[PDB]
Design a protein around this motif. Structure first.
Motif, PDB file in Angstrom:
ATOM      1  N   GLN A  17      -4.438   3.991 -12.274  1.00 26.80           N
ATOM      2  CA  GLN A  17      -4.521   3.751 -13.745  1.00 26.80           C
ATOM      3  C   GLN A  17      -5.411   2.532 -14.015  1.00 26.80           C
ATOM      4  N   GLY A  18      -5.456   1.596 -13.097  1.00 27.47           N
ATOM      5  CA  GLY A  18      -6.310   0.383 -13.294  1.00 27.47           C
ATOM      6  C   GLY A  18      -5.441  -0.878 -13.247  1.00 27.47           C
ATOM      7  N   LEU A  19      -5.030  -1.283 -12.071  1.00 26.66           N
ATOM      8  CA  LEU A  19      -4.170  -2.493 -11.944  1.00 26.66           C
ATOM      9  C   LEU A  19      -4.698  -3.394 -10.834  1.00 26.66           C
ATOM     10  N   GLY A  20      -3.968  -4.433 -10.515  1.00 22.53           N
ATOM     11  CA  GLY A  20      -4.425  -5.361  -9.441  1.00 22.53           C
ATOM     12  C   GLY A  20      -3.263  -6.212  -8.918  1.00 22.53           C
ATOM     13  N   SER A  25       2.464  -4.859  -9.516  1.00 22.24           N
ATOM     14  CA  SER A  25       3.920  -5.065  -9.254  1.00 22.24           C
ATOM     15  C   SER A  25       4.698  -5.038 -10.571  1.00 22.24           C
ATOM     16  N   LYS A  26       4.217  -5.734 -11.568  1.00 25.87           N
ATOM     17  CA  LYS A  26       4.925  -5.760 -12.885  1.00 25.87           C
ATOM     18  C   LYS A  26       5.023  -4.339 -13.449  1.00 25.87           C
ATOM     19  N   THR A  27       4.090  -3.487 -13.105  1.00 29.00           N
ATOM     20  CA  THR A  27       4.118  -2.091 -13.626  1.00 29.00           C
ATOM     21  C   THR A  27       5.126  -1.245 -12.835  1.00 29.00           C
ATOM     22  N   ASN A  29       7.916  -1.309  -9.133  1.00 28.54           N
ATOM     23  CA  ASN A  29       9.039  -2.152  -8.645  1.00 28.54           C
ATOM     24  C   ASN A  29       8.760  -2.748  -7.245  1.00 28.54           C
ATOM     25  N   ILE A  30       7.593  -3.308  -7.013  1.00 25.83           N
ATOM     26  CA  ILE A  30       7.313  -3.906  -5.664  1.00 25.83           C
ATOM     27  C   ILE A  30       6.260  -5.015  -5.774  1.00 25.83           C
ATOM     28  N   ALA A  31       6.351  -6.010  -4.921  1.00 22.12           N
ATOM     29  CA  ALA A  31       5.371  -7.140  -4.955  1.00 22.12           C
ATOM     30  C   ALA A  31       3.965  -6.617  -4.656  1.00 22.12           C
ATOM     31  N   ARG A  32       2.968  -7.462  -4.759  1.00 24.56           N
ATOM     32  CA  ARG A  32       1.572  -7.016  -4.509  1.00 24.56           C
ATOM     33  C   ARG A  32       1.294  -6.842  -3.011  1.00 24.56           C
ATOM     34  N   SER A  33       1.763  -7.737  -2.179  1.00 19.46           N
ATOM     35  CA  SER A  33       1.502  -7.592  -0.717  1.00 19.46           C
ATOM     36  C   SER A  33       2.291  -6.386  -0.210  1.00 19.46           C
ATOM     37  N   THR A  34       3.479  -6.197  -0.730  1.00 23.91           N
ATOM     38  CA  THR A  34       4.316  -5.027  -0.329  1.00 23.91           C
ATOM     39  C   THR A  34       3.586  -3.759  -0.767  1.00 23.91           C
ATOM     40  N   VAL A  35       2.955  -3.832  -1.908  1.00 25.11           N
ATOM     41  CA  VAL A  35       2.187  -2.678  -2.426  1.00 25.11           C
ATOM     42  C   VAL A  35       1.093  -2.348  -1.414  1.00 25.11           C
ATOM     43  N   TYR A  36       0.450  -3.349  -0.858  1.00 20.45           N
ATOM     44  CA  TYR A  36      -0.635  -3.073   0.122  1.00 20.45           C
ATOM     45  C   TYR A  36      -0.073  -2.524   1.411  1.00 20.45           C
ATOM     46  N   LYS A  37       1.198  -2.697   1.669  1.00 24.23           N
ATOM     47  CA  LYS A  37       1.784  -2.060   2.878  1.00 24.23           C
ATOM     48  C   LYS A  37       1.565  -0.551   2.692  1.00 24.23           C
ATOM     49  N   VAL A  38       1.685  -0.124   1.455  1.00 22.73           N
ATOM     50  CA  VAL A  38       1.476   1.300   1.090  1.00 22.73           C
ATOM     51  C   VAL A  38      -0.020   1.683   1.142  1.00 22.73           C
TER      52      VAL A  38
END
Length: 43
Positions: A17-20, A25-27, A29-38
């Motif tokens: 959608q266009g995030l960073g 994370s605010k959008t 339910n996970i932190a940004r570094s945790t998001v990069y695990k994905v």
């Protein structure tokens, strides 16, 4: 299984959608570094 009991649309929306990192994370339910695990898994 392949598409039986597994998520994918969650992270697929927070990025396609266009995030960073922080804003992603605010959008969802996970932190940004945790998001990069994905994002790194590329699953």
């Amino acid at each position: 299984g392949r598409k039986r009991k597994i998520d994918r649309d969650a992270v697929l929306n927070m990025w396609q959608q266009g995030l960073g990192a922080s804003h992603i994370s605010k959008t969802m339910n996970i932190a940004r570094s945790t998001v990069y695990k994905v994002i790194n898994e590329s699953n």
